[PDB]
Amino acid sequence: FISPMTPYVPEEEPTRTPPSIKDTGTLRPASEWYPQWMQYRRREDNYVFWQDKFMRCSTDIPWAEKRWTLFSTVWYLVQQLRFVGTPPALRYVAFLGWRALMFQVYAAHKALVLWQCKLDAGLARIGSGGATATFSKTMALRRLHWRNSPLAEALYALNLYKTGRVHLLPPVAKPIPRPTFFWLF
């Protein structure tokens, strides 16, 4: 009745906590404590670093993460064994090992993204003859930040391979909501 142009997109409650303010989003390990951009911001405006810890862990918990289920009942045992059942020394050495492995896998993913840029240029030549031979740097950063679905990747690759159009990009993939199955999970 009161149709406001754009079809009303219902805004459901969030099911996952928003990612931390120290995150990178690129499979690279985050910093140890301080996210290193604070030094390029003014003091007493960096108050939102602890205001991320609050409302990421105390005051703005989504109610989909407070659901009690059989899977969460089982998973509490894993988390309890991790936190109060395993010594922090062994947790620290495992944390160092995971940090090194994640740095290595980030370097591997960065090299894979650069090779996908080269493949982007190749597929953009085969499909537009020889004219378009560039590649989309925004799509490169989109692949690096894991913002693309496999369907979007395949559609973009096919689009390059048979019409070119490097700077015509697929839509950004929405975040995956937390799955819920009644009392099971």
Binding site: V84, P87, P88, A89, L90, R91
Partner: peptide, 13 residues
């Protein structure tokens, strides 16, 4: 040795 790596109270809420 696992109990020794536990050591004291640190790391526990």
């Amino acid at each position: 040795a696992l109990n020794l790596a536990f050591w004291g109270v640190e790391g526990m809420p």
